C-alpha cells in the first residue's frame, strides 16, 4: 500500500497462469499414473513405448511452459490483455489435447502441437508489436532530432 | 518513475524467488559434481544408478520449478504477500530435502516430495482464493443487474 | 486504467524476455530438424551422439531458461534496469553459442557455458545486491530501536 | 477337355484372387523401398520404428492372405459367387487401409484392420452357411429315415 | 450354370478347410489376448518368453498352413476325398495341441509338432500316389509305343 | 460322381503345387538343421548372420509361396496349363537358389530373387491375359447394346 | 572316548546327507559339463536358456540343501530316526528328478518341484512337532505351578 | 538308545534352527510371488529393480545361512546354550528387516544388514571363547611340561 | 547336564568349522569392497568383469561350503576325526587360493579349485568308508542268519 | 655421395612400394566416405554390416600391409627385384579386389583373400629361397672344415 | 664391410624414423594409462567415450605408421633426404597434436589429421616425381630408339 | 649391379625380418582359426572373451610390428647387426610367449609383454645410441669451429 492495485490490469493474465499450472499438474499426475501402470520406478525414464509417450509429452508441455508464461504476461502488459489471455487458452487446450494425443500415439501429436504452435506464435507476435510500439516512436524522434540541424 | 514504485509489495515474493534460483543453481552444480565422480559425459544422462538419481532430482526440480514461480507470484499478489512467501519457503526447503533424499535413494524422496506437493496444492489454492475474490463479486452483481428488470 | 502504467519501467526487461523466447524457439526447431535428418522419431530422446548433443544442448537451455527469467526480472525491478538487461543479452548470446558450439561437439560447450555461467551469476549478485539494499535499512533500524531503552 | 468350362463359375472369384496377388506385392515392393530408405539390410528384420510398421504390416497382411483366398473360393462355391466377391473386394480395400495406416502409424492400423475382421467374418459366414445347406438335409434325413421303424 | 455341379466332390475337403480357418483366426485373437496381458505393442514381437511363445506358436501354424490346404486339396481330388479330409481333421487337431502345448512350453510343442508331421506327410504321400496313378499309365505306354516297331 | 472329371485339366498345376510343398518342407527341415547346429531354441528367431539367413530365406519363401500358388492356378485355368506349369516349375527352382545362395550370403540371395520375380511376373500377366479375355468380349458387347438404339 | 558312541543315534541320517552331498555335486559336474558345451566361461553364469536353465536348477538345489539338511537333523532327532531319514531319500529323488527336468525345460521342474516341498514341509512339521513334544510339557506344567496356589 | 539323550542340550538350538529354516521358506515363497507379479519366469534371475531387489534379498540370506547355522551350534555347544540361541533369535530378526527392508529399497537394506552382522560377529566370538577355553588350558599345560625339566 | 560332555569328540571338527566360517566371512567383505572400488550397487550383481570375478569367487565358495560342512562332519565322526579336521583345512586353504586366484584371473582359480575338490572327494570317501563300516556288519550278518537254516 | 647410387637396384620395389601406399590411400578415404554415409562418427567403429564391412576391408588391408613390404623387400633384395616386383604386383591388385568384394559382401572377401594369400606366400618362399642361397654354402662349408682332421 | 657404408645417405631417415617410434610407444603407454584411469581390461577396446577415444587415436596412428616409414624411404631416397626428413617431422608433430586433440574431443582430431594428410601427401608426391626421374628418362629413350628406323 | 653387394651387411636383419612375417602369418592363421571355432563371421570382431582374447593377442602384435621392423633395421645398420638380429629374436620369441599365454588368458599376457616391452626398448637404445654415435662428433665439432675464433 499504496491507495491503487494493479491486479485490475493484469487478473486475466493470472487466471491463465493458474489454469496453466493447473494443467502441468495433471500431466503430472498422468506420468504418475503411468509409472504406476507400466511398473517404471524413478530413476527410470524408460520403458514401453506407451509409457514413454505419457512422459515424453508431460516433458515436452513442461518445456514450452515457461515460454508460454514469459509471452502471455509480456503480450498482456504490451499490447492487450484480453487479446493474450485468449491466445493463452487457445494454447493450454492445444496442450492438453497434445498431451492426450500423443499418450495415444506419436502421431495424434502433431494436429494439436502445430494448433498450439500457431497460438504462442500468435502471443509472439502481439508481444513484438507491443514492444514495438513502445520503443518505435522515442527511437524515430531521437533520430530525427539529431537530422534536425543539417 | 513514476513518484512510487511497487517494490515494497513484492519484496518478499522477490526474496523467495531468488532463494529458489540459488537452489536450482546448487541442483545443477550437484549433477556437476556427480558427471566428474561417476564419469559420465554429456550428452549422456544414463549411467549408475546413483548418478542417475542425481541427474533425475535436478530435472525434477527443474520442471516443477516454474509451477512454484509462477503460483507463487500468483498468490502473492491476490491473496497474501505473506502467507505465499511462506508456503514458498517450506516449498523450498522440501525440495531440498527431496533432493538430498533421492540422492541417497528413490525410495526417500517420497516423504519429501509430499511435503512439497502440499505447499505448492497450498500456493494453488490462494492463488485460486485471491482470483475468486477479484472476480466473483463483479460477475455476480452483473448477473444480479440482468435479472433486475423481470 | 489507472492514469498511469509500469510499463516504461520494465520495457527493456520484457524485451530481452521476448529475444530469450525466440532464441528458445530457434533451439526447438532446430532440435525437430535433428530428428528428421538422424530419423529419430518420438517418444526416442536418444539416437547418434550428433543427434543427442542437438536434444540436449536445447534441453539445456530450457532447464536453465527460467532461472535467466526469474533473475532478469528480480535484478532489474530491484538493482537497475539497464545493467539487468545487458547482463541478460550476454547471457542469451552465450546461451547461443553454447547450443551452436555443443551442436558440433561436446567440449565446445565449455567455454560458452562458462560465458553464461558468469552473466547469470552476475544477474544472480545484482539482485541479491537490491534485495539487500531494500531490507537490510529497515532491519537494522529495527535491531537498534530494540537496543534504543538500554 | 471336356465340352464344358467351370470358369464361368468361379471367374469373379479368380478376378479378386489375383487383384489380392497384386496388393501383396504393392506391400512387398514397399517393404523393399523401405529397407533402401531406412538402410536395413537382410537378414535384419528390426530397425527404426518406422521401418518395423511397414515390415510388421506387410508381415500381417500376408499371414492373414490365405485365410482370405480359402474363405473367398468356399464361400464362391457354397453360398454366392458375387457376394464373396464383393466381401473379397472389400477385404482387400481394407487391408491396403491397413498397410498405409500402420506404415504412417501403429494406432492408425486399428480402425482398417477392424473393417478387414468385418468382411473377413462375413466370408466366414457365408461359407458356413453354404456347407450348412450342403451337409445338413441329407444328414437330417438319414437321422429321420434311422427312426422311422420305431 | 451349367446342369451340374461339382460340390459334391469337394464338401469335405471345403469343411475341414473352413474349420483351418477358424483354427488360424483362434490363433489370431490368442496373440492379440497376450499382447493385451504382456503389454507388448505392435510393431513389437518381442518381449517375455511367454509372450514369444504365443506369438511363434501363431506364426508357425500360418507358416504351414498354406502347405496343408495345398496337398489337403491334392490329396483329396487325385488320391481320395474322405481320406484326405481326415488326414486333414488330424492335422489340425494336432496343430491346436501345438499352440496349447507351445504356449506352455517351448518343449510341449515337440509332441504335437510330430503328429502333425506325420499327419502331413500322409496327406503328401496320398497326393504324390494320386499323381503317379495320373500319370504314370499314359507316359508307359507312350515308352512302349515308342519301342514297338523294334 | 458324376461321370466326368476335371482332373485332367489341372494335373500338372496339381504336381507343380505338390513340388511346391515339397521344397518348403524342405526349407523348414533346413531351418530345424540350422536351429540344431547354431543351438538357436524356439522361441529365438535371432542367433549368428548365419542362422538368420537360412531362418529368413525360409520365411520369405514361405510369404511368398501363396502367392505362387494363386496365381499359378488362375493362369492355369484362364491361360493355359502347360504354360502355367512351366512358369511355375522355373519359379521354384529359382526359389532353390534363392535360399541355398541366401543362406551362403545375404548378397547371393539377389540374382534368383530377380529371376523367381521374373517367373512369378510372368504368371501375373498370364493370369490376367486371361481374365481379360473371359471378361471384356462380354463387357464391350454389353456397352455396344447400350449404344445401339442412339 | 567315552565308553559309548551316539552314531547308532544317527547313522541314517548321516547317510541321507551324504547322499545329498554326492546329488549336490553330480548337479556341479553337469554345470561344468554345460559350461564346455555351451562355452560359458566363468565369470558368465548368463548364455542361451539351456545353459541358464542347467545353471540354475544346480543353484536353486544348492539353495535349499541347507534347509534340507537343518530340518532331517532336527527331524531326525526330535521325532523319529527312520521316518526324517525316509523323508529325506523322497526329498532328495524329487530333487534329482528338479534338476533333470528343469535342464529339459522350465515347465519340467514344476511337478518334481511339487514333491521336493512336500517332502521338505513334511521334515518340517516333524520338527516342529518333536520340539513341541520336548518344550510344551514342561512349560504347561510351570503355568500351572504357578497358578497352584490361588 | 542309550539309556541318556543329549537332546536336552541343543534344544534351544534345534528350535532357533527351525524357525531359521521356516523365515528362509517364507523368503523363498516372497521371491515365488515376486515372479508372479514381475512376470519374470524362470531361469530368469532379472528384471525390474523392484523385483531384483527381492531375489537378491532371498538370495542374501540364503548364502549366511549355514554361516549362521554353523556358529550358533559352536557357540551353543563350546560357549553356552542360551546366550547362542538368543544371539540367534537377535540375528534371524534382524534378518527378516534386512528382507523387508531391502525389498522396499536398496538403501533400507543397510541398517538390519548392520544389526544382523553384530549379531552373527558375536556368535563368532562366542564360538571363538568356548573354542579357546577348550583347547587352551591342555596346550599351556603341554608346554609348560615339555620345559619343566629345565 | 548330563555327566558327561561330547564336546572332546568334536572340538576339532568345530575348529575347523569357525575356520571355514570366518574364511566365508572374509570373502564376503572382499565383495562389499570390490563393490565400492568398482562403484556396483546392490541389487546389480554385474560390473566389468574384474567386479564379477571377485563376486562369483564368493558365491562359489559359499555354494560348496555346506557340502564341506555336511562331509567334515560325517567324515569326522563315523571315520576318524583327526583325519576330517586335516582334510578340512586342506579345503579351506584350498578355497583362500581359489578366490585369490579367480579374483586375479578366471584361468587362476583352476589349480586350487582341483585342490579343493580332491580334498572334498577325499572327505567324501572317508565319508562312506567310515558308514559302510557301520551298516555293512550288521546287514551281512542278517543276510546270512537268513540263509542259515538252508 | 659416394660416387654410386644402390637406386637402380631396389627402383621397382620402391615403385610397388608406393603403388601400395597409394592404395592403402584409397581404402582410408573409402572408409572416410563410408562414415559420412553411414553417418558412423568417431570413436565408433560399429554401425550397419555394410559400414563394418568397409571399415573391417581397409583394417585388414592395413594389417597386412608391413607384412607385404617386409617380405616384398627381402624377396627383391635376395632372391630376384623383378620376380619380387611382380608378385607384388599381383597381391596388390588381389587386395583391391579383397576390398571391392568385402564391401559388397563378407562372402566376397574369399577368393581375392584367397588369390592374396597365394601372392604373399609366394613372395614368403622367394625371400625363403634367398636367405637360405646366402646363408647355407657357408655353414655347410664351416660344418665340412670341422670334420675334415677326422 | 665394404670399404664403404652408405649410412651417411640416410642417417637423417633413419633418425626421424627412431622418433616415429617413440611417438607411437608414447600413443600405446597412454592407452596402458586409460585403461587404467577407466577399468577397462583386456580384450575390451569399448568404454565410455573418453576412453574409445584415447584407444582409436592410437590405433589410427598406428594403421598410418606403415604409410609414413614407406614414404619417407622412398622419398628420401629417390627425391632428397632433407626434404623428405622435414615432411617427416612435419608428419609426426601434426600426429602427435592429432592424438592429444582426439582425446580430449572427436572434432579436435580434426585440424591435425588434415595437417598430418597434408605431409604425407607431400612425402607421397616427392616420392612419386622421385621414381618418375629415375623411370621416365630411359622409357622415353627406348620408345624413340623403336621409332628411330622409321 | 654393381660389383658388390650390401646382402651380407644385412642379411640377419632380413632373416629375422622373415621369421617376423611368418610368426605373424601363425597369428593370422590362428584368428581364422578362432573365427571357425566360435562361429565368429566377419565383419564381427567380438564374440566370447575366449574369440576375444585370439582376435585381440594378433591385433596386438600386428601394431607393434612395424615398430619392431623400424627399430631392428635401424638398430642394426647404425649400431651392430649381431646385436640388434640378437634382440630382434628375444622380441619374436617373446610375442609368441604373448600370444599363447593371452590366448588363454588376459592375465597370462602380462609377464611376456614385459619380456617383448625390455627387448624393444632396448632395440630402441642400440638405435639411438648408434645414431648418436653418428651426429654427434660433426655437430660438437662444428660447435667448436664457431667458437673458435674467440
Ligand atoms: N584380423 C584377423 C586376421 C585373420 C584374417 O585375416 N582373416 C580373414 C579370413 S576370415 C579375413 O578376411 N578377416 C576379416 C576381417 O579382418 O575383418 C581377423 O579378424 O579375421
Ligand atoms: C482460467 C481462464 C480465465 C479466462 C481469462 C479470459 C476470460 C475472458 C477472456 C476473453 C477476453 C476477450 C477480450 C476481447 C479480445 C478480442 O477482442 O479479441
Ligand atoms: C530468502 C527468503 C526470504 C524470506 C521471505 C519471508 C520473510 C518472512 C516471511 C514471513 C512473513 C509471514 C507473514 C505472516 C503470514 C501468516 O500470518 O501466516
Ligand atoms: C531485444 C533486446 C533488447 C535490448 C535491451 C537493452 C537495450 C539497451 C540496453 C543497454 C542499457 C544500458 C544502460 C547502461 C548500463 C550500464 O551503465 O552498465
Ligand atoms: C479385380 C476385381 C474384380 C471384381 C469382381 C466383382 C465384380 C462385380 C462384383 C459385384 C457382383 C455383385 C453381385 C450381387 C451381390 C449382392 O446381391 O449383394
Ligand atoms: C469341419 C470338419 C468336417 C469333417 C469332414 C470329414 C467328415 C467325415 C470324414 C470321414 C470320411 C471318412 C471316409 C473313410 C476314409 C477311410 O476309409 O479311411
Ligand atoms: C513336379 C513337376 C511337374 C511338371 C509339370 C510340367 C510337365 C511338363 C510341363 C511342360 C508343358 C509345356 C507345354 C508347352 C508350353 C509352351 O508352349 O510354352
Ligand atoms: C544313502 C541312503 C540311506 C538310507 C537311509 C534309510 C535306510 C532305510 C530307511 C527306512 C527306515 C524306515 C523306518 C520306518 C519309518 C516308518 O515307519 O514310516
Ligand atoms: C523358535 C525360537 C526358540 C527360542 C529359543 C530361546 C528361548 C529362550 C532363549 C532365552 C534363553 C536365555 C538364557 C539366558 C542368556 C543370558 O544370560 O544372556
Ligand atoms: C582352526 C583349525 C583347527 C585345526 C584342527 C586340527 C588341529 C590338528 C589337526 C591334526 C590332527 C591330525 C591327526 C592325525 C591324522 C593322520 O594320522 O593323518
Ligand atoms: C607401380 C608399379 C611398378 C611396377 C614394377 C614392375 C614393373 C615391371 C615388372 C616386371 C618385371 C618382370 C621381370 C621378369 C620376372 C620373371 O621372369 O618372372
Ligand atoms: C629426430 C629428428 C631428426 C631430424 C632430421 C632432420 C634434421 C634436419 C632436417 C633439415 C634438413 C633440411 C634440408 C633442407 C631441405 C629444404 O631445402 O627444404
Ligand atoms: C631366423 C632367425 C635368424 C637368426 C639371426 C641371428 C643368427 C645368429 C645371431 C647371433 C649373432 C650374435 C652376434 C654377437 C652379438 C653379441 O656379442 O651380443
Ligand atoms: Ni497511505
Ligand atoms: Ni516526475
Ligand atoms: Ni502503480
Ligand atoms: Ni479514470
Ligand atoms: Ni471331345
Ligand atoms: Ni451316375
Ligand atoms: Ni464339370
Ligand atoms: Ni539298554
Ligand atoms: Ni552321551
Ligand atoms: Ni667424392
Ligand atoms: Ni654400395
Ligand atoms: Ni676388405
Same mark, same amino acid.
Given at each position: 500500500?499504496?491507495?491503487?492495485?494493479?491486479?485490475?490490469?493484469?487478473?486475466?493474465? +493470472? $487466471?491463465?497462469?493458474?489454469?496453466? /499450472?493447473? @494443467?502441468? =499438474?495433471?500431466?503430472?499426475?498422468?506420468?504418475?499414473? &503411468? #509409472?504406476? %501402470?507400466?511398473?517404471?520406478?524413478?530413476?527410470?525414464?524408460?520403458?514401453?513405448?506407451?509409457?514413454?509417450?505419457?512422459?515424453?509429452?508431460?516433458?515436452?508441455?513442461?518445456?514450452?511452459?515457461?515460454?508460454?508464461?514469459?509471452?502471455?504476461?509480456?503480450?498482456?502488459?504490451?499490447?492487450?490483455?484480453? +487479446? $493474450?489471455?485468449?491466445?493463452?487458452? /487457445?494454447? @493450454?487446450? =492445444?496442450?492438453?489435447?497434445?498431451?492426450?494425443?500423443? &499418450? #495415444?500415439? %506419436?502421431?495424434?501429436?502433431?494436429?494439436?502441437?502445430?494448433?498450439?504452435?500457431?497460438?504462442?506464435?500468435?502471443?509472439?507476435?502481439?508481444?513484438?508489436?507491443?514492444?514495438?510500439?513502445?520503443?518505435?516512436?522515442?527511437?524515430?524522434?531521437?533520430?530525427?532530432?539529431?537530422?534536425?540541424?543539417?
Amino acid at each position: 500500500h499504496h491507495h491503487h492495485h494493479h491486479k485490475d490490469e493484469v487478473a486475466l493474465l +493470472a $487466471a491463465v497462469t493458474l489454469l496453466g /499450472v493447473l @494443467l502441468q =499438474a495433471y500431466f503430472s499426475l498422468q506420468v504418475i499414473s &503411468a #509409472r504406476q %501402470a507400466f511398473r517404471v520406478s524413478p530413476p527410470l525414464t524408460t520403458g514401453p513405448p506407451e509409457f514413454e509417450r505419457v512422459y515424453r509429452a508431460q516433458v515436452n508441455c513442461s518445456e514450452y511452459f515457461p515460454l508460454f508464461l514469459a509471452t502471455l504476461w509480456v503480450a498482456g502488459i504490451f499490447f492487450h490483455e484480453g +487479446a $493474450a489471455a485468449l491466445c493463452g487458452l /487457445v494454447y @493450454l487446450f =492445444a496442450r492438453l489435447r497434445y498431451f492426450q494425443g500423443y &499418450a #495415444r500415439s %506419436a502421431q495424434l501429436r502433431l494436429a494439436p502441437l502445430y494448433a498450439s504452435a500457431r497460438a504462442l506464435w500468435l502471443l509472439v507476435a502481439l508481444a513484438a508489436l507491443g514492444l514495438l510500439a513502445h520503443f518505435l516512436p522515442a527511437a524515430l524522434r531521437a533520430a530525427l532530432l539529431g537530422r534536425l540541424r543539417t
